[PDB]
PDB file of N, CA and C in Angstrom:
ATOM      1  N   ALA A 348      18.754  61.623 106.375  1.00 23.67           N
ATOM      2  CA  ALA A 348      18.372  60.684 107.278  1.00 23.67           C
ATOM      3  C   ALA A 348      17.479  61.268 108.460  1.00 23.67           C
ATOM      4  N   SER A 349      16.944  60.477 109.151  1.00 25.63           N
ATOM      5  CA  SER A 349      15.962  60.865 110.217  1.00 25.63           C
ATOM      6  C   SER A 349      16.873  61.660 111.302  1.00 25.63           C
ATOM      7  N   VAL A 350      16.092  62.231 112.192  1.00 22.41           N
ATOM      8  CA  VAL A 350      16.672  62.841 113.292  1.00 22.41           C
ATOM      9  C   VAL A 350      17.407  62.018 114.128  1.00 22.41           C
ATOM     10  N   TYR A 351      16.972  60.881 114.605  1.00 22.72           N
ATOM     11  CA  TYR A 351      17.912  59.744 115.040  1.00 22.72           C
ATOM     12  C   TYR A 351      18.426  58.938 113.951  1.00 22.72           C
ATOM     13  N   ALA A 352      19.442  58.237 114.205  1.00 21.60           N
ATOM     14  CA  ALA A 352      20.321  57.497 113.155  1.00 21.60           C
ATOM     15  C   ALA A 352      20.851  58.543 112.176  1.00 21.60           C
ATOM     16  N   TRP A 353      21.322  59.651 112.729  1.00 22.40           N
ATOM     17  CA  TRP A 353      21.897  60.730 111.861  1.00 22.40           C
ATOM     18  C   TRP A 353      23.157  60.352 111.246  1.00 22.40           C
ATOM     19  N   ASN A 354      23.243  60.824 109.894  1.00 18.41           N
ATOM     20  CA  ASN A 354      24.536  60.468 109.298  1.00 18.41           C
ATOM     21  C   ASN A 354      25.793  60.911 109.786  1.00 18.41           C
ATOM     22  N   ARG A 355      26.995  60.421 109.620  1.00 15.45           N
ATOM     23  CA  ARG A 355      28.149  60.935 110.273  1.00 15.45           C
ATOM     24  C   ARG A 355      29.166  60.499 109.138  1.00 15.45           C
ATOM     25  N   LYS A 356      29.686  61.506 108.433  1.00 15.95           N
ATOM     26  CA  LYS A 356      30.496  61.431 107.292  1.00 15.95           C
ATOM     27  C   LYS A 356      31.955  62.039 107.839  1.00 15.95           C
ATOM     28  N   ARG A 357      33.103  61.379 107.532  1.00 15.17           N
ATOM     29  CA  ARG A 357      34.420  61.866 107.860  1.00 15.17           C
ATOM     30  C   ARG A 357      35.089  62.535 106.697  1.00 15.17           C
ATOM     31  N   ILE A 358      35.768  63.665 106.927  1.00 12.43           N
ATOM     32  CA  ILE A 358      36.268  64.347 105.846  1.00 12.43           C
ATOM     33  C   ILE A 358      37.890  64.682 106.332  1.00 12.43           C
ATOM     34  N   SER A 359      38.815  64.292 105.364  1.00  9.63           N
ATOM     35  CA  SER A 359      40.201  64.484 105.703  1.00  9.63           C
ATOM     36  C   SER A 359      40.970  64.531 104.496  1.00  9.63           C
ATOM     37  N   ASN A 360      42.129  65.168 104.559  1.00 11.64           N
ATOM     38  CA  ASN A 360      43.094  65.202 103.530  1.00 11.64           C
ATOM     39  C   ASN A 360      42.504  65.804 102.260  1.00 11.64           C
ATOM     40  N   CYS A 361      42.272  67.113 102.375  1.00 14.12           N
ATOM     41  CA  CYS A 361      41.699  67.864 101.227  1.00 14.12           C
ATOM     42  C   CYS A 361      41.911  69.261 101.474  1.00 14.12           C
ATOM     43  N   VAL A 362      41.722  70.117 100.358  1.00 14.68           N
ATOM     44  CA  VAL A 362      41.625  71.500 100.379  1.00 14.68           C
ATOM     45  C   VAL A 362      40.075  71.986 100.591  1.00 14.68           C
ATOM     46  N   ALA A 363      39.761  72.428 101.561  1.00 16.48           N
ATOM     47  CA  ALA A 363      38.504  72.728 101.926  1.00 16.48           C
ATOM     48  C   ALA A 363      38.170  74.340 101.714  1.00 16.48           C
ATOM     49  N   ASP A 364      37.169  74.641 100.903  1.00 14.53           N
ATOM     50  CA  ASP A 364      36.789  75.951 100.636  1.00 14.53           C
ATOM     51  C   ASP A 364      35.465  76.121 101.379  1.00 14.53           C
ATOM     52  N   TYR A 365      35.255  77.018 102.379  1.00 13.48           N
ATOM     53  CA  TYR A 365      34.087  77.349 102.936  1.00 13.48           C
ATOM     54  C   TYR A 365      33.362  78.541 102.488  1.00 13.48           C
ATOM     55  N   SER A 366      33.881  79.309 101.691  1.00 13.65           N
ATOM     56  CA  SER A 366      33.282  80.426 100.962  1.00 13.65           C
ATOM     57  C   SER A 366      32.128  79.950 100.082  1.00 13.65           C
ATOM     58  N   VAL A 367      32.161  78.780  99.495  1.00 12.79           N
ATOM     59  CA  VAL A 367      31.163  78.375  98.670  1.00 12.79           C
ATOM     60  C   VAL A 367      29.805  78.032  99.471  1.00 12.79           C
ATOM     61  N   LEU A 368      29.888  77.562 100.682  1.00 10.54           N
ATOM     62  CA  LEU A 368      28.768  77.285 101.629  1.00 10.54           C
ATOM     63  C   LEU A 368      28.138  78.523 102.114  1.00 10.54           C
ATOM     64  N   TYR A 369      29.050  79.506 102.694  1.00 11.94           N
ATOM     65  CA  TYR A 369      28.571  80.719 103.255  1.00 11.94           C
ATOM     66  C   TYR A 369      27.930  81.557 102.163  1.00 11.94           C
ATOM     67  N   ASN A 370      28.440  81.548 100.918  1.00  7.96           N
ATOM     68  CA  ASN A 370      27.833  82.411  99.814  1.00  7.96           C
ATOM     69  C   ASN A 370      26.607  81.881  99.435  1.00  7.96           C
ATOM     70  N   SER A 371      26.248  80.610  99.705  1.00  8.55           N
ATOM     71  CA  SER A 371      24.895  79.913  99.210  1.00  8.55           C
ATOM     72  C   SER A 371      23.833  80.716  99.784  1.00  8.55           C
ATOM     73  N   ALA A 372      22.813  81.057  98.950  1.00  8.68           N
ATOM     74  CA  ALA A 372      21.699  81.877  99.400  1.00  8.68           C
ATOM     75  C   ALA A 372      20.602  81.055 100.032  1.00  8.68           C
ATOM     76  N   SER A 373      20.539  79.663  99.589  1.00 13.72           N
ATOM     77  CA  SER A 373      19.391  78.825 100.174  1.00 13.72           C
ATOM     78  C   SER A 373      19.632  78.643 101.760  1.00 13.72           C
ATOM     79  N   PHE A 374      20.901  78.372 102.209  1.00 13.95           N
ATOM     80  CA  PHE A 374      21.010  78.319 103.659  1.00 13.95           C
ATOM     81  C   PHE A 374      20.386  79.407 104.420  1.00 13.95           C
ATOM     82  N   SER A 375      19.429  79.056 105.300  1.00 14.07           N
ATOM     83  CA  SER A 375      18.548  79.975 105.964  1.00 14.07           C
ATOM     84  C   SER A 375      19.311  80.341 107.291  1.00 14.07           C
ATOM     85  N   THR A 376      19.988  79.219 107.833  1.00 14.01           N
ATOM     86  CA  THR A 376      20.759  79.419 109.091  1.00 14.01           C
ATOM     87  C   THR A 376      22.212  78.901 108.814  1.00 14.01           C
ATOM     88  N   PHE A 377      23.151  79.762 109.446  1.00 12.18           N
ATOM     89  CA  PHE A 377      24.563  79.275 109.243  1.00 12.18           C
ATOM     90  C   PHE A 377      25.335  79.740 110.613  1.00 12.18           C
ATOM     91  N   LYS A 378      24.686  79.483 111.715  1.00 10.00           N
ATOM     92  CA  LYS A 378      25.428  79.776 112.952  1.00 10.00           C
ATOM     93  C   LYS A 378      26.749  79.123 113.065  1.00 10.00           C
ATOM     94  N   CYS A 379      27.788  79.857 113.570  1.00 11.86           N
ATOM     95  CA  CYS A 379      29.047  79.253 113.723  1.00 11.86           C
ATOM     96  C   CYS A 379      29.456  79.527 115.172  1.00 11.86           C
ATOM     97  N   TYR A 380      29.825  78.520 115.967  1.00 15.46           N
ATOM     98  CA  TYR A 380      30.148  78.487 117.368  1.00 15.46           C
ATOM     99  C   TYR A 380      31.675  78.263 117.501  1.00 15.46           C
ATOM    100  N   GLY A 381      32.382  79.017 118.170  1.00 14.05           N
ATOM    101  CA  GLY A 381      33.775  78.866 118.482  1.00 14.05           C
ATOM    102  C   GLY A 381      34.729  79.288 117.258  1.00 14.05           C
ATOM    103  N   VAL A 382      34.229  79.828 116.162  1.00 12.06           N
ATOM    104  CA  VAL A 382      34.955  80.248 114.978  1.00 12.06           C
ATOM    105  C   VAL A 382      34.229  81.186 114.321  1.00 12.06           C
ATOM    106  N   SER A 383      34.880  82.136 113.588  1.00  9.90           N
ATOM    107  CA  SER A 383      34.307  83.137 112.679  1.00  9.90           C
ATOM    108  C   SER A 383      34.103  82.637 111.405  1.00  9.90           C
ATOM    109  N   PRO A 384      32.895  82.669 110.871  1.00  8.44           N
ATOM    110  CA  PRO A 384      32.676  82.261 109.457  1.00  8.44           C
ATOM    111  C   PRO A 384      33.540  82.834 108.394  1.00  8.44           C
ATOM    112  N   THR A 385      33.912  84.160 108.581  1.00  6.87           N
ATOM    113  CA  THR A 385      34.703  84.653 107.585  1.00  6.87           C
ATOM    114  C   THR A 385      36.129  84.358 107.691  1.00  6.87           C
ATOM    115  N   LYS A 386      36.701  84.007 109.081  1.00 11.56           N
ATOM    116  CA  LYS A 386      38.009  83.454 109.215  1.00 11.56           C
ATOM    117  C   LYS A 386      38.044  81.998 109.169  1.00 11.56           C
ATOM    118  N   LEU A 387      37.513  81.487 108.157  1.00 10.30           N
ATOM    119  CA  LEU A 387      37.513  79.810 108.070  1.00 10.30           C
ATOM    120  C   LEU A 387      38.425  79.389 107.000  1.00 10.30           C
ATOM    121  N   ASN A 388      38.678  80.232 105.919  1.00  7.42           N
ATOM    122  CA  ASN A 388      39.681  79.836 104.899  1.00  7.42           C
ATOM    123  C   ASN A 388      41.102  79.937 105.321  1.00  7.42           C
ATOM    124  N   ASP A 389      41.349  80.392 106.572  1.00  7.25           N
ATOM    125  CA  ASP A 389      42.724  80.887 107.002  1.00  7.25           C
ATOM    126  C   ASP A 389      43.123  79.655 107.970  1.00  7.25           C
ATOM    127  N   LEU A 390      42.397  78.772 108.318  1.00  4.93           N
ATOM    128  CA  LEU A 390      42.672  77.728 109.275  1.00  4.93           C
ATOM    129  C   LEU A 390      43.071  76.432 108.796  1.00  4.93           C
ATOM    130  N   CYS A 391      43.291  75.457 109.804  1.00  6.55           N
ATOM    131  CA  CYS A 391      43.609  74.182 109.432  1.00  6.55           C
ATOM    132  C   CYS A 391      43.265  73.268 110.533  1.00  6.55           C
ATOM    133  N   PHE A 392      42.488  72.241 110.120  1.00  5.25           N
ATOM    134  CA  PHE A 392      41.945  71.132 111.124  1.00  5.25           C
ATOM    135  C   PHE A 392      42.421  69.737 110.760  1.00  5.25           C
ATOM    136  N   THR A 393      42.388  68.930 111.681  1.00  8.20           N
ATOM    137  CA  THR A 393      42.636  67.543 111.552  1.00  8.20           C
ATOM    138  C   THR A 393      41.652  66.627 110.976  1.00  8.20           C
ATOM    139  N   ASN A 394      40.451  66.833 111.515  1.00  7.96           N
ATOM    140  CA  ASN A 394      39.329  66.062 111.002  1.00  7.96           C
ATOM    141  C   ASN A 394      38.127  66.903 111.126  1.00  7.96           C
ATOM    142  N   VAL A 395      37.217  66.635 109.958  1.00  7.82           N
ATOM    143  CA  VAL A 395      35.847  67.456 109.921  1.00  7.82           C
ATOM    144  C   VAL A 395      34.847  66.437 109.789  1.00  7.82           C
ATOM    145  N   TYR A 396      33.807  66.578 110.727  1.00  8.39           N
ATOM    146  CA  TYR A 396      32.737  65.618 110.442  1.00  8.39           C
ATOM    147  C   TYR A 396      31.457  66.535 110.149  1.00  8.39           C
TER     148      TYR A 396
ATOM    149  N   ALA B 942      79.436  70.274 151.327  1.00  8.00           N
ATOM    150  CA  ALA B 942      78.702  71.198 150.402  1.00  8.00           C
ATOM    151  C   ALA B 942      77.464  71.884 151.011  1.00  8.00           C
ATOM    152  N   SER B 943      77.163  71.578 152.254  1.00  9.61           N
ATOM    153  CA  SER B 943      76.101  72.178 152.947  1.00  9.61           C
ATOM    154  C   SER B 943      76.396  73.517 153.684  1.00  9.61           C
ATOM    155  N   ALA B 944      77.526  74.041 153.485  1.00  9.47           N
ATOM    156  CA  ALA B 944      77.775  75.281 154.245  1.00  9.47           C
ATOM    157  C   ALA B 944      76.893  76.535 153.646  1.00  9.47           C
ATOM    158  N   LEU B 945      76.775  76.544 152.447  1.00  9.66           N
ATOM    159  CA  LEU B 945      75.991  77.753 151.947  1.00  9.66           C
ATOM    160  C   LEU B 945      74.604  77.403 151.602  1.00  9.66           C
ATOM    161  N   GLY B 946      73.807  77.000 152.881  1.00  7.42           N
ATOM    162  CA  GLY B 946      72.513  76.891 152.822  1.00  7.42           C
ATOM    163  C   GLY B 946      71.644  77.990 152.452  1.00  7.42           C
ATOM    164  N   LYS B 947      71.925  79.133 153.109  1.00  9.60           N
ATOM    165  CA  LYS B 947      71.067  80.382 152.923  1.00  9.60           C
ATOM    166  C   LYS B 947      71.258  80.851 151.532  1.00  9.60           C
ATOM    167  N   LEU B 948      72.372  81.013 151.018  1.00  9.10           N
ATOM    168  CA  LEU B 948      72.543  81.497 149.489  1.00  9.10           C
ATOM    169  C   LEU B 948      71.799  80.668 148.533  1.00  9.10           C
ATOM    170  N   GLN B 949      72.076  79.201 148.715  1.00  7.95           N
ATOM    171  CA  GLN B 949      71.243  78.294 147.805  1.00  7.95           C
ATOM    172  C   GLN B 949      69.847  78.444 148.002  1.00  7.95           C
ATOM    173  N   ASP B 950      69.304  78.590 149.297  1.00  4.75           N
ATOM    174  CA  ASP B 950      67.889  78.708 149.405  1.00  4.75           C
ATOM    175  C   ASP B 950      67.305  80.040 148.749  1.00  4.75           C
ATOM    176  N   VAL B 951      68.053  81.071 148.796  1.00  2.00           N
ATOM    177  CA  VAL B 951      67.488  82.305 148.172  1.00  2.00           C
ATOM    178  C   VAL B 951      67.421  82.150 146.714  1.00  2.00           C
ATOM    179  N   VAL B 952      68.599  81.473 146.189  1.00  2.37           N
ATOM    180  CA  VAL B 952      68.642  81.299 144.663  1.00  2.37           C
ATOM    181  C   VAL B 952      67.430  80.366 144.172  1.00  2.37           C
ATOM    182  N   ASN B 953      67.215  79.294 144.968  1.00  3.42           N
ATOM    183  CA  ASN B 953      66.171  78.341 144.670  1.00  3.42           C
ATOM    184  C   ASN B 953      64.803  79.191 144.822  1.00  3.42           C
ATOM    185  N   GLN B 954      64.624  80.025 145.764  1.00  6.56           N
ATOM    186  CA  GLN B 954      63.190  80.655 145.882  1.00  6.56           C
ATOM    187  C   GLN B 954      62.991  81.652 144.788  1.00  6.56           C
ATOM    188  N   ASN B 955      64.078  82.268 144.471  1.00  5.31           N
ATOM    189  CA  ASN B 955      63.828  83.265 143.181  1.00  5.31           C
ATOM    190  C   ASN B 955      63.621  82.387 141.825  1.00  5.31           C
ATOM    191  N   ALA B 956      64.447  81.335 141.689  1.00  6.49           N
ATOM    192  CA  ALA B 956      64.126  80.483 140.477  1.00  6.49           C
ATOM    193  C   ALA B 956      62.800  79.892 140.610  1.00  6.49           C
ATOM    194  N   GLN B 957      62.210  79.449 141.754  1.00  4.29           N
ATOM    195  CA  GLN B 957      60.924  78.996 141.705  1.00  4.29           C
ATOM    196  C   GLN B 957      59.789  79.905 141.447  1.00  4.29           C
ATOM    197  N   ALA B 958      59.917  81.146 141.894  1.00  2.08           N
ATOM    198  CA  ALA B 958      59.031  82.195 141.552  1.00  2.08           C
ATOM    199  C   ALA B 958      59.063  82.408 140.166  1.00  2.08           C
ATOM    200  N   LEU B 959      60.055  82.703 139.444  1.00  2.32           N
ATOM    201  CA  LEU B 959      60.114  82.850 138.008  1.00  2.32           C
ATOM    202  C   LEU B 959      59.532  81.661 137.186  1.00  2.32           C
ATOM    203  N   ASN B 960      59.879  80.361 137.598  1.00  4.47           N
ATOM    204  CA  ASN B 960      59.308  79.308 136.910  1.00  4.47           C
ATOM    205  C   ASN B 960      57.803  79.222 137.196  1.00  4.47           C
ATOM    206  N   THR B 961      57.306  79.551 138.251  1.00  3.99           N
ATOM    207  CA  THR B 961      55.949  79.569 138.430  1.00  3.99           C
ATOM    208  C   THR B 961      55.204  80.581 137.559  1.00  3.99           C
ATOM    209  N   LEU B 962      55.769  81.662 137.453  1.00  3.21           N
ATOM    210  CA  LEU B 962      55.188  82.817 136.539  1.00  3.21           C
ATOM    211  C   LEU B 962      55.312  82.258 135.094  1.00  3.21           C
ATOM    212  N   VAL B 963      56.334  81.662 134.643  1.00  2.84           N
ATOM    213  CA  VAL B 963      56.453  81.146 133.283  1.00  2.84           C
ATOM    214  C   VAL B 963      55.320  80.157 133.100  1.00  2.84           C
ATOM    215  N   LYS B 964      55.238  79.290 134.007  1.00  2.00           N
ATOM    216  CA  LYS B 964      54.184  78.091 133.787  1.00  2.00           C
ATOM    217  C   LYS B 964      52.677  78.817 133.919  1.00  2.00           C
ATOM    218  N   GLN B 965      52.621  79.713 134.689  1.00  2.85           N
ATOM    219  CA  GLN B 965      51.282  80.525 134.877  1.00  2.85           C
ATOM    220  C   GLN B 965      50.912  81.000 133.343  1.00  2.85           C
ATOM    221  N   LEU B 966      51.921  81.423 132.511  1.00  2.00           N
ATOM    222  CA  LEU B 966      51.652  81.731 131.136  1.00  2.00           C
ATOM    223  C   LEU B 966      50.814  80.876 130.393  1.00  2.00           C
ATOM    224  N   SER B 967      50.586  79.565 130.895  1.00  2.00           N
ATOM    225  CA  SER B 967      49.950  78.595 130.178  1.00  2.00           C
ATOM    226  C   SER B 967      48.828  77.825 130.951  1.00  2.00           C
ATOM    227  N   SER B 968      47.920  78.528 131.358  1.00  2.00           N
ATOM    228  CA  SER B 968      46.666  77.973 131.957  1.00  2.00           C
ATOM    229  C   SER B 968      45.383  78.598 131.303  1.00  2.00           C
ATOM    230  N   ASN B 969      44.434  77.922 130.793  1.00  2.00           N
ATOM    231  CA  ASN B 969      43.349  78.423 130.041  1.00  2.00           C
ATOM    232  C   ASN B 969      42.713  79.664 130.690  1.00  2.00           C
ATOM    233  N   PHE B 970      42.587  79.592 131.951  1.00  2.00           N
ATOM    234  CA  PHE B 970      41.805  80.746 132.788  1.00  2.00           C
ATOM    235  C   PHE B 970      40.237  80.652 132.387  1.00  2.00           C
ATOM    236  N   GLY B 971      39.816  79.736 131.688  1.00  2.00           N
ATOM    237  CA  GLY B 971      38.389  79.567 131.234  1.00  2.00           C
ATOM    238  C   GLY B 971      38.269  79.935 129.713  1.00  2.00           C
ATOM    239  N   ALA B 972      39.307  80.584 129.097  1.00  2.00           N
ATOM    240  CA  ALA B 972      39.198  80.948 127.610  1.00  2.00           C
ATOM    241  C   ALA B 972      39.182  79.595 126.866  1.00  2.00           C
ATOM    242  N   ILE B 973      38.842  79.836 125.529  1.00  2.00           N
ATOM    243  CA  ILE B 973      38.901  78.675 124.655  1.00  2.00           C
ATOM    244  C   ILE B 973      40.218  77.984 124.535  1.00  2.00           C
ATOM    245  N   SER B 974      41.352  78.941 124.590  1.00  2.00           N
ATOM    246  CA  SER B 974      42.681  78.454 124.438  1.00  2.00           C
ATOM    247  C   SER B 974      43.667  79.283 125.443  1.00  2.00           C
ATOM    248  N   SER B 975      44.846  78.733 125.660  1.00  2.00           N
ATOM    249  CA  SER B 975      45.842  79.324 126.512  1.00  2.00           C
ATOM    250  C   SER B 975      46.818  80.248 125.715  1.00  2.00           C
ATOM    251  N   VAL B 976      46.559  80.324 124.216  1.00  2.00           N
ATOM    252  CA  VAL B 976      47.457  81.024 123.494  1.00  2.00           C
ATOM    253  C   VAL B 976      46.704  82.116 122.840  1.00  2.00           C
ATOM    254  N   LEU B 977      47.245  83.293 122.729  1.00  2.00           N
ATOM    255  CA  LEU B 977      46.552  84.588 122.388  1.00  2.00           C
ATOM    256  C   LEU B 977      46.300  84.630 120.822  1.00  2.00           C
ATOM    257  N   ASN B 978      47.338  84.241 120.158  1.00  2.00           N
ATOM    258  CA  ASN B 978      47.359  84.280 118.729  1.00  2.00           C
ATOM    259  C   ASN B 978      46.117  83.399 118.097  1.00  2.00           C
ATOM    260  N   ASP B 979      46.059  82.213 118.535  1.00  2.00           N
ATOM    261  CA  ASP B 979      44.949  81.365 118.062  1.00  2.00           C
ATOM    262  C   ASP B 979      43.630  82.067 118.379  1.00  2.00           C
ATOM    263  N   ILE B 980      43.424  82.575 119.596  1.00  2.00           N
ATOM    264  CA  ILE B 980      42.067  83.217 119.896  1.00  2.00           C
ATOM    265  C   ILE B 980      41.860  84.424 118.948  1.00  2.00           C
ATOM    266  N   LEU B 981      42.893  85.244 118.661  1.00  2.00           N
ATOM    267  CA  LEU B 981      42.727  86.332 117.735  1.00  2.00           C
ATOM    268  C   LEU B 981      42.321  85.817 116.205  1.00  2.00           C
ATOM    269  N   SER B 982      42.970  84.714 115.868  1.00  2.00           N
ATOM    270  CA  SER B 982      42.848  84.124 114.479  1.00  2.00           C
ATOM    271  C   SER B 982      41.640  83.485 114.268  1.00  2.00           C
ATOM    272  N   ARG B 983      41.043  82.858 115.340  1.00  2.00           N
ATOM    273  CA  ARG B 983      39.759  81.992 115.079  1.00  2.00           C
ATOM    274  C   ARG B 983      38.456  82.789 115.328  1.00  2.00           C
ATOM    275  N   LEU B 984      38.457  83.791 116.004  1.00  2.00           N
ATOM    276  CA  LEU B 984      37.295  84.573 116.428  1.00  2.00           C
ATOM    277  C   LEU B 984      37.310  85.871 115.945  1.00  2.00           C
ATOM    278  N   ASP B 985      36.222  86.656 115.755  1.00  2.00           N
ATOM    279  CA  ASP B 985      36.076  88.151 115.492  1.00  2.00           C
ATOM    280  C   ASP B 985      36.186  88.908 116.852  1.00  2.00           C
ATOM    281  N   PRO B 986      36.512  90.080 116.751  1.00  2.00           N
ATOM    282  CA  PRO B 986      36.852  90.799 118.038  1.00  2.00           C
ATOM    283  C   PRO B 986      35.602  90.788 118.971  1.00  2.00           C
ATOM    284  N   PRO B 987      34.352  90.891 118.619  1.00  2.00           N
ATOM    285  CA  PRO B 987      33.197  91.009 119.370  1.00  2.00           C
ATOM    286  C   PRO B 987      33.227  89.593 120.289  1.00  2.00           C
ATOM    287  N   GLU B 988      33.495  88.587 119.654  1.00  2.00           N
ATOM    288  CA  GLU B 988      33.464  87.375 120.269  1.00  2.00           C
ATOM    289  C   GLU B 988      34.966  86.816 120.930  1.00  2.00           C
ATOM    290  N   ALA B 989      35.843  87.638 120.523  1.00  2.00           N
ATOM    291  CA  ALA B 989      37.237  87.211 121.058  1.00  2.00           C
ATOM    292  C   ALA B 989      37.578  88.087 122.223  1.00  2.00           C
ATOM    293  N   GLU B 990      36.870  89.263 122.553  1.00  2.00           N
ATOM    294  CA  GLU B 990      37.192  90.045 123.625  1.00  2.00           C
ATOM    295  C   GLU B 990      36.847  89.387 125.007  1.00  2.00           C
TER     296      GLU B 990
END
């Protein structure tokens, strides 16, 4: 989508693997704020947008 | 039952001080969270210090 009218998808009730995204080579930027990218498979969240 | 005013006053003062300390254990103080274990689990040491 355009910069305005950005998409918003709700993700819940799943087993989420974040090592697939971080290991991706295409991603040029992967900044993480408030959480450690390596310490993401050990956590649990209520809703992910 | 109002005879022992001073003894009850002393007991209440000590209990108030202890309760205030225990409740002070749970104020953010500006950090991301008021619990230490989650701070250690969510962030790397450089960003958790």
